[PDB]
Every structure is written in C-alpha cells, then in structure tokens.
Design a binder for this molecule. Structure first.
Ligand SMILES: [Ca+2]
Ligand SMILES: [Ca+2]
Ligand SMILES: [Ca+2]
Ligand SMILES: [Ca+2]
Ligand SMILES: [Mn+2]
Ligand SMILES: [Mn+2]
Ligand SMILES: [Mn+2]
Ligand SMILES: [Mn+2]
Lengths: 15, 237, 237, 15, 237, 237, 15, 15
C-alpha cells in the first residue's frame, strides 16, 4: 500500500 | 501571442473549461481546450513513460502514455503542423500547480527530428537524449520555477527541501537550439519525443499536470498561466 | 503457403486482375490484389526513393515514392500487422519481368525496427544500411536471379552483359537475420524502410515492378510467380 | 531528351 | 581451425597458464594467454558494464569495465584486425564454469559496426540492441548451455531453479547475421559493443569468466573448453 | 582568452611559422603551430571528406581526410581533453584566405557526442546532421564572411557571383547549442564529426585552409586572424 | 550481500 | 579541370 489516487480505469498492474 | 502545440498529461478535471470528468491525456492546438482527449489512469507515486510521434506523410499527431505493467492510454489527432507552426520552433516541457499540487519530475527526455528534402537522401537530423540532468545544464533554457541537478532529475515546479511539492507554481525547460520542424520542399518530415515522469501528490487530488510542447522560438511563460493553464496559455479560450 | 505483406511499385497495369489503368503504388496483404492504391508517375531512366513507415500506435502502414524535383505519390492503409504476420519475420525486396522488361536496380537500402515492451525503456532495436553491395554479400539471402556486386548495386532481375534487362525473370533479397516485428507485451512497435531504385526499360512498356515485403522466415519464390506476380504470389486470388 | 515512358501525371521535375 | 579475438572478463587466476594473481580483464588474440591485462575489482552480486571499441584509423582495441560508483578497469592493445580476422565474422558472448562456479547473466547487449568506402557519404552499418531476451530469440544462436527467457535475461551457463550456478558448464550466444568487420576499400571502419552483466557466486568464489568475442562465421564450442578456456580455445597454448 | 582545439586542413605552407613545405593536415592545441602534422595530397576541384574521432578511454584525437579513389592522409595525437577544454564548449568550422584564395565550401556536416555516467545504461547524447543548408539556418551561428543557402551549401569565405573566391576573407559556423564534451563522472565519453568539402582555386594556388574546431562557448573571430591564422588564433606563437 | 572473492583490491564502496 | 598547386605528391588518379 502507498497509492494511485483518484485513479481512473481498468485492468492494469504497476502497483 | 505565442503559437503552441502541446500534448498534455492533465491531472485535474476543470470541467469549467472543457476537461472531461477524469484525469486525461490530450492534444492541444493553440488552445487549452483539447481538440481530442483520452482517459488516463494516472498512478500517483510511480514512474511512467510518454511517447509522442508525428510524420508528414500521415499528418497525424499521436501519443502514448503508460506505466510498466498497467494499461496504456492513446490519443491521436489529424493535423497539418505546416500551417499551424512556423518552420522554426523550440521544443520543451511545461508543468504547473495551483490550489492542489503534485511533483512534476522528469527523469529522462529524448527527441529526434528528421527532414529529407526533395533531393533525396538529403536528410537533416537532430537528436538529443537526457538521462541525467546536471545542476548547470547549459543546453537547456529554464523558465519559471524549473531547476535541474537534484538527484540528476529535472524538477519543473517548486519542491520543498524534503521533497514536498508547492502550490501555484510553473516552470518549463526548452531545448537550447532552434528546431527545423518542417520545410516547404520536404518529401518526409517526422519527429518523436519520449520522456519518463514521476508525479507524486500529498493532498487530496494532484494537479495540474505536465505537457510536451512546441512553440515559436522566443516563447515564454504567460502571466498567471499557473494552475489549469499548464504554463502554456494566457487565458482559457 | 507463405504470409506476405508488401508495398508494390507496380509498373504495368494488369487490369485483368485488379490493377488500375496506370502505373501505381500499392499495399498488398496476402494477395496480389492491393487493398489500396495510388497513381504513380514512374520515370524510366532516373533514380527514385521509397520510404515506408508503420507504428503500432496508429496501426497505419504508409508509403511515399518520389523522384528528386518531381511530385511524390502516397498510399496508406489501416492494418493491425499483429494478426496478419507471425511475430518473427524476414524482410526483403522482390522484382520481376515477363513479356515486357525493365531493370530493377537497388542502389541503397536501410531498415530500422524498434520494440519497447511494457517495462519501459526496454527497447530492442535492429538497424542495417546498405549503400554499397559487394559481390559476396553474406548478410543477404539471394533468391531467383538476384545478384550483387555490379557497380556496387543490387540487381534483382536478370541483366545482360551490356545492361539490357531480360524477360521472364524473378529474384529477391531478404536480410539474413530474422526480425521481431511485434510482441504481445509491446507498448510501442515501429519500423521504417527506405531504398533508392533505378528502373530503365528499352521496349514499349516497362514491367513488372519492385516490392518491399515482409514474410515468414523460410519464404521462397513461388513457382511461376514471374510477371504480374512480382515473385510474391503463386496465383492472383 | 531520353525519357519517362507511358508516364502518368501532373506537375513534376526530375527530367 | 577457429580464429578468435576476445576481451575477457576473467574472474579467475589460473596462474599456471599466464593469468595474473587476481581478477582481471584482458585482450586475447588467438590464444587464452592475454596479450595485455589489467587488474579488475570484480564485484559479486553487482551489475556491471563492459564497453568495447575499435577503429581502423588508430587500430587500437580498447575496453572499459566498471560498476556504478566504483572505478574503472581499462585495457588497450594495438592490433590491426585486417591481418587477424577474415572479412566476414560473427560476434558474440561466451562464459564458463569448472571446479568453481558463478552465474554469467547478461542483462542487455548492444553492438554497432560501420564501414565507409570509396564514395563520399557511402557507409554500410549494422546495429542491434537487446534489453529484453525472449524465450525464443530467433535472431540469436545459442550454443552449449546458453539459454534465454528467464527474467528476460540471457543465462550463458547452467543455474538451476533456485538460481544457484552449476560447475563444469559452457555456453555462447552469437548474433544470427554475419558481420562485415573490414574491407580493403574502407576509409574508416569501426565498431563498439556494450553489455551489462551480473556475476554472482553464492559460495562466494567466482570462476571462470565471461567474454566478448569475434570469430569466423562457422565457430562452435571447442572440446573441453569449459573452465579456464572460457569456451573459446581448444588448448592453453 | 579563447581555448581552441582544432584539426586543420592547411592548404598552405607558411614555413615561417612551422608549416611543413607542402599541403598537410594537423592537430592544433591552443596554437597555430600544430603538435603533429601529416602530408596531404589536397585536390582542387574535387569533393573530399574529413573524419574526426576521439574517446576518453584512449584519449587520442584522430583525423582522416580522403578523396574518392585517392589515398588517405591520417594524423593522431595523444591528448587528454579534460585538461585543455572547459566542461561546456561549442563546436564548429572555420576557414580563411589572404594574399591567395580558394573557395571553402562545405557540402555536409555531421556530429555526435556521448557521455555515460555513474549509472548503468545512463548516457546523454547529442547528434546533428546537415546535408542541406537553408538561407536562414537558425541553428547555426555564422561569424565573419560565412553564409549559407547558395546551392544548399555553406560558404565559409567570400566567393562573389561568378563563383570566384576572394582574398583576405574569414568566416566561421558554430552549432547553436552548447555541447557537454566531458565530465569527471563520465565512464566513457566520445565524439565523432564528419564533413565533406570542396576547395577550388581558379588561379590554381590554394590558401589558406579549412578547420574543424572546439572552443569555449563565447568564442569569436580574433583580430586579423585571416590568412595563415585560419580565423582561430590571434597570433602565431 | 554475499560480498565475494574473485574481485581485485584498492578503492571501493559498500556496507 | 584546373588541376591545382597546394596539394602534396605520391599516389594519384586523373585525366
Ligand atoms: Ca485540467
Ligand atoms: Ca501489374
Ligand atoms: Ca581464468
Ligand atoms: Ca598555412
Ligand atoms: Mn485538459
Ligand atoms: Mn498492382
Ligand atoms: Mn586471463
Ligand atoms: Mn599548418
């Protein structure tokens, strides 16, 4: 856990 | 005023001036109101890559932005740069913050331009690649809050002593030499730009974004072009 | 059979199988019947240039053929090479004659391919450039009547002692090493090919043309693929 | 004079 | 029967055949007994970099091996390659283990060759770059225990599942296409190669080394050339 | 006040200041009196080629000048450029005439510089290629009588309408952007430059020469540096 | 970090 | 071809 905020979409991987 | 053509990595949605309701990628032609956009899954905290291409045969400007192992976003727009930009221009990177902030760190940047006149193999080319930025980068013109040398990276906007980003900041970096982007008698003209960035944000939403742009040689940061204006436009028309 | 993708510089109009009523440029996908074509003002006697480009972002294959100081011809077609070609291929040049003839001389040839996986700067590249062809070009696979070393050029089809072209001839030249043209996990994949040619013809109409092609590694000249078949297809389906 | 045969088109120059 | 020219990254003192009494880098011309060596502070578990260059004007073969932050080991030798190698050769990487072992992992490999001849601006060039290695690398010739695919890397010798190196192992990797390394007519001929490596020894006692080599097109591993012979020479004369 | 490093194409024996008694090529370090020279069979009316190279590993500056079919004049000198030039410099071309004249026409110019640092695969590079020269070449700094546009070429000294060279003339051309020619951290630093020239003398009695040089960013033509001084040095010490 | 044997001496860096 | 002066000697080519 750390984060990618108000992120958007679908199937992706770079934690 | 200046003549801008840019590919923006917009992190905040200012629906009050065109922005879609989510972080997005976009192509801007002389206006902050993108001619075309695409959804983008920004990932606060990690290193991403942006690839930008254009050739005079298809006259199509396309961009790709992705994060290692995640999905990538693509945006394309048909445009004849010949009658939008002057034959000689300057290329650079711009970034800004405002109410909300984020770091706008450039870890590497490369550019390649090629022009072959109708005389054949008469190809003119320009190529530069930056993987390390020294404290005194004489081949770069720094405007606004831009600075180099820290960790060998290029920080486009203000960053505190500990690394915390600051609000209401703008800065750009343009390559020193003018670039011949198109010629009247050119069979083929093309260019490709690439750069890796790192956008980290402490507060709620990060803002405002980064953008690759091409402009008239003597271009400079418009007054008040902070925030939603990405240090590229004086107003939002 | 083989899997071909080619950009043909068709010099003779075989309207009996699709050809437009004039010399033309075209994009062929597994068939001699071009998916798209463009008019071409062939100039018997002088050196011309052909530029071919493709990138996985726009997934558009485009070609440009011109003569110094004359007008150029352009042809483009949207195609996702990923599901047309195998990930490993071979690239080469093909040419042929039949009832009518012409010389099919290649004066220079360069190729560049780049593949960057979703791991970032993980770019794989291949590049070769031929400006001189020796009598023993070990990095080329010659098929049919192809020969090198004469004047440092690559003659794809039969040429007499004095330089007169011969009828019913075919020959190709493929670069020796296999090429990785696309990868499953590739953010961006692109390639560009260029070559200068010299088509001279003694009789009425020159024929039959030259073509840049990509195929399965072990590809070879089909039987009877002379004439209208440009040494690429067994039949005209 | 030498030639470009059954040529095609418009405004061009490489004799 | 084989002509070999190589820059060896000797991680092992076989002082019984010439090796100095410490890890070193050296230049070999048709013999395992280096013409010139240079002390090398090899570093286990750390990624290193090797850079090899050569030009026909100076006729000097130079190599640099370094680790980030540490210093560099350098070695040079004056040799006219026109009198040592055939016109067409094949380039590659080799490594071996014997009584003692280490992993000989290659993380990336680049190579560029250029030849200019009796014609203004007339140059032939070959360039390839590997940052990722597929399980099925059709443009590489793997000999002995060499393999690819594991973490996108190229393992020159056996390593097992848990990543521990095996003794008495030998492997090589050569680029598929032959290379034109020189020619009488050539005005300026030069080449430069680069590769990053990771030599790890769990037992902590490295052997036997990695090497960059050039040889005749039909070269293959000599009998019992494991261990001190680095998979290059048949004997230690 | 200026630091100059240059390879001179001396078409004139000023045996009163060191020049051998025949046309030659030489390497100058802060003085017009070459450190090392080499007989050169200069050819009037014929296009020639100059190739200059240098790397930090060997620290040798080499140059080759040749004409198609004729032989090559070569010259090398061992010099560590880290102790002669500042970190940032500007590269360019210079030429002059005096009592006697010749045309100093440049038909093409290429340059490539590279720096690798304390980071695996971390390199900075600059590359530019000129085959055509526009009347308004904004990426070049023309000093003295230098001009561009005439036949797409770059005329370093005066030539008049009927193409006849003028005496007592001096001109230079420098690339606009500063160049990073070296750095302490650099593991491998190197550069190579190439240009084709046409030295013609109607009266048939050449003078004074052309030169490729590197200098501090703020360099300009010294007083009375026409003639034997090649527009580089203020005196002949 | 299994440091290691077969690596020369003089100037270094580590922990 | 105004041949020319300021060019050394030894091996050549011409007409
Ligand atoms: Ca916005
Ligand atoms: Ca046809
Ligand atoms: Ca050993
Ligand atoms: Ca002189
Ligand atoms: Mn926007
Ligand atoms: Mn057709
Ligand atoms: Mn040894
Ligand atoms: Mn001199």
């Amino acid at each position: 856990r750390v984060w990618y905020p108000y992120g958007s979409y679908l199937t992706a991987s770079g934690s | 005023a200046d003549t801008i053509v840019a590919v923006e990595l917009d992190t905040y949605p200012n629906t009050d001036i065109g922005d879609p309701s989510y972080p997005h990628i976009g192509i801007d032609i002389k206006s902050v109101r993108s001619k075309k956009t695409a959804k983008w899954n920004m990932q606060n905290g990690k290193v991403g890559t942006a690839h930008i291409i254009y050739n005079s045969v298809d006259k199509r400007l396309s961009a790709v932005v992705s994060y290692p192992n995640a999905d990538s976003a693509t945006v394309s727009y048909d445009v004849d740069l010949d009658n939008v930009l002057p034959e000689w221009v300057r290329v650079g990177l711009s970034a800004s913050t405002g109410l909300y902030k984020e770091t706008n760190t450039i870890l590497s940047w490369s550019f390649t331009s090629k022009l072959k006149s109708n005389s054949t193999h008469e190809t003119n080319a320009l190529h530069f690649m930056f993987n390390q930025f020294s404290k005194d980068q004489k081949d770069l013109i720094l405007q606004g809050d831009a600075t180099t040398g820290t960790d060998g990276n290029l920080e486009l906007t203000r960053v505190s002593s500990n690394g915390s980003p600051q609000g209401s900041s703008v800065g750009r970096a343009l390559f020193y030499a003018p670039v011949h982007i198109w010629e009247s008698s050119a069979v083929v003209a093309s260019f490709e730009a690439t750069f890796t960035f790192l956008i980290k944000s402490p507060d709620s939403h990060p803002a405002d974004g980064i953008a690759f742009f091409i402009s008239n040689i003597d271009s400079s940061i418009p007054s008040g072009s902070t925030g939603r204006l990405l240090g590229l436009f004086p107003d939002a028309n």
